[PDB]
Design a protein around this nucleic acid. Sequence first.
RNA 1: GUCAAGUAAUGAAGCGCACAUGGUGGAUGCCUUGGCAGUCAGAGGCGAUGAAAGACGUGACAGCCUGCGAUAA
RNA 2: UGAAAUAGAACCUGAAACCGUGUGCGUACAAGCAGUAGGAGCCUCAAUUUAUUGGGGUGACUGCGUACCUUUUGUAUAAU
RNA 3: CCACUGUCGUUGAAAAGCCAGGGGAUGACUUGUGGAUAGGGGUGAAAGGCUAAUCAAACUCGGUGAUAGCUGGUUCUCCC
RNA 4: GGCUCAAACUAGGAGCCGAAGCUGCGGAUUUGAAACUUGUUUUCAAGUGGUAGGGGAGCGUUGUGUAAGCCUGUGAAGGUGUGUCGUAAGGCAUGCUGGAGGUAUCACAAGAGCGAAUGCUGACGUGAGUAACGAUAAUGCGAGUGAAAAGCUCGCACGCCGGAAGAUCAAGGGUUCCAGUCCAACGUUAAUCGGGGCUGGGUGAGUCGACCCCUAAGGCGAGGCCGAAAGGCGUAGUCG
Lengths: 116, 53, 44, 109, 119
Amino acid sequence: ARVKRGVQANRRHKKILKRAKGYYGARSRVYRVAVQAVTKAGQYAYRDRRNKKRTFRRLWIARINAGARLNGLSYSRFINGMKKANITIDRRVLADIAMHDAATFGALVEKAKAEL
Amino acid sequence: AVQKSRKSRSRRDMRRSHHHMTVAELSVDATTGEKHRRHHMTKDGFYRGRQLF
Amino acid sequence: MKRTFQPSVIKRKRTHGFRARMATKKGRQVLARRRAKGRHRLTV
Amino acid sequence: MEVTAKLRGAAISAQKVRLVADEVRGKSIERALDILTYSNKKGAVFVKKCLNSAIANAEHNHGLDIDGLKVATIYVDEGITLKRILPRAKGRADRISKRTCHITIKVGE
Amino acid sequence: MRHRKSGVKLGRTSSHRKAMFQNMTNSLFEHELIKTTLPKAKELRRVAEPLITMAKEDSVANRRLAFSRMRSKTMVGKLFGTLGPRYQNRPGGYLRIVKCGNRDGDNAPMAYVELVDRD
RNA sequence: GUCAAGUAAUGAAGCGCACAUGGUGGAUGCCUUGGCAGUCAGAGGCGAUGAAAGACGUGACAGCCUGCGAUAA
RNA sequence: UGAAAUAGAACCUGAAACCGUGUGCGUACAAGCAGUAGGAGCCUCAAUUUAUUGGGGUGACUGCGUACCUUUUGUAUAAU
RNA sequence: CCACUGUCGUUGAAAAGCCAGGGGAUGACUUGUGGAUAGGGGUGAAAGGCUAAUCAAACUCGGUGAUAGCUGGUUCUCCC
RNA sequence: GGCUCAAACUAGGAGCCGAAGCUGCGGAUUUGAAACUUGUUUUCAAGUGGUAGGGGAGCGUUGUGUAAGCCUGUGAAGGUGUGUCGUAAGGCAUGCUGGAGGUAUCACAAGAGCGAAUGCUGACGUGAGUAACGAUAAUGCGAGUGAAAAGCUCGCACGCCGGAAGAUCAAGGGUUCCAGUCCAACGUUAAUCGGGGCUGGGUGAGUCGACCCCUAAGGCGAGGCCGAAAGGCGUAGUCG
């Protein structure tokens, strides 16, 4: 029962090369270079999937810091004010209010400013 | 002596970016009306209104 | 320079030829072994 | 339409003919022939031979006015390679590739 | 460096170069129209014209001097017989170079060398 | 409109990626005239009446292979 | 002619390496395993009452990021 | 017929050469042809030299798929 | 970078940032726990980084039975895209290409899965259109032929060898010799030319050589001697 591996090898190698499309040079053409580029891409994606949550919080905090400083206090005093006023609004929503509706954020800072 | 890694096809083609073919300058002879290279006799021998054979 | 082969027909037929093979017991074993392999050239 | 001529088997490297092909690509039937007849490259005799055959095919088989023709497409491919051995010093041999090229020309209005 | 120097080398020894242009000058004097390489055509003006100039006046010394530099009694008689009294009134430029393309065997620039006045 | 200051867009000698379309190459798939392992039986020799292996010939037809041997496909 | 001729004799199928041609986008002030997470712009298809989404291509700009195997106490290793 | 010195050549024109010089050149000379000595054997004005570009034990086949506490490699996936 | 009543140091205080830690939400999974009870179901608790290595569950491939079945020229395998599904190996569907085969399900058996072994074979890259084109005796021009001539033929001239680079052989080779014809490959370029391809022709002996007669070294060697066998030696001779 001789088994020829050409057919299964072809679609196996093709599966890796299809996943390596858009890569430069040998990384999208030859399997030996493409297989470890696909693995490395998956490793970056797994780590960057944690770092994304880490990077957007930095973005929200900076946006909130700009908004609070435009009218009144800083971010460090803003978060303390929201915490003392029992305001649960997340930094994601706050940064969206600051960047897209400045009247509401002005009213939102006042509630934090009167609480300290 | 020799390379430590194969040149990429891209890098090989950037060296070929000055590889052009020379295009001759042509003219029309006044007498025969034939096309010929500038400052050269026409294939049948005419250059600047003059016969060579 | 002088190379190793330097052919000579009388010397070739006298050390490797058909009658030289057949004149010894082991030379006939050489011929039998060429024939068992089916070689088209028995002797030089 | 597009009238095609092929010159499969030209005994010359493709790299040497791609230079000649890059100067007649897109040119009119007349400018391309002047470029080819006054070129110093060997690949120009091969391109002109294939270009001229494409012109006759348009004039004869397709009944098309050659005065309005143009070199619509041209590309040089790699052909079959003849493999030879070249002796070097110290009893070493290399492989020599004698490359050939295919020349495809398409003329059209 | 090559500042202000004259002459050709043409990948030959000087003895070969001297003999080659002697042969060319004799060939140009016989047929009066030769086809040669353009660098050779231009240098032929410096060996062939001075022979025509010295044949403008005919004497044994001049006749013998030409044969020293030409070594062809057939062309020396022709040089002093017809080429002399044809360019008598012409102040140089006895031959013209006409470029005639490139050679097939090696793509060398070619040129015709023709004597002026019916060569 | 003229000037000043500020600031876009546009380029490609070549190159990258994707797609389309080819060339080269001969994988894969399908296929078999060829092999491999056996079962049940038979046989176990050929040769001085010249063997086994060959050489050279032999045809209407040039070569090789196959057959044949001057009675020579 | 043939059902078929990119079945035309190097002939069934015709993969990949490798080499061209065309189209779209990017690319000539910017430093590195060439990706990844974001992301403007552009181009192209399908709906939709008409730039609003969705699919595809490209990837300006930002963050992070020193191949794989083996062998090792320990390798981006300038160790195989 | 040799091979002392140097340059060149060192993917050579050449797996030992060319060039400029150099040594012997009636002799223990050189050379053609044929023959003899065969592997732990031969031959050696002796270098472990040479014995078919192979020599502190030739080459070919066989024992043989020698052995290798050594090095390399060892191919689909997920769960504990 | 820059920082001097700090952006340094000491002693305190309050905020905030900050990890794959903790929590929140969704989903999977191992083990144990109350039961329609073998994943029949709802949960709960504690877990789920991992080399060597141990344990468990599966995927795909070739072949056998299932199968004289089922599918297939209204298009099999294979190839190449796309969509979709699963934790994964992978499955399914379908556009094009292809043109004659494939195989559900469940068992069964393996030449059963490759990126590495300075692995093996073939093909093709990079270097790179780079080095080089093989004695520095040397070529120029005019005609001819030709699709095309620096290289072929003829001519004039030039140069080189001339104790050879000229002639006769032996060895070795074997048709390379001559003519006609062709230029794909071969010739380190071109080629109309060639020791290349193809087709014909060509080698004439009493005196040249071989054969022949004779022998050298050295072989073989009726009988003979010696030796487990194979064989070794040797006389007359017979070759050489």
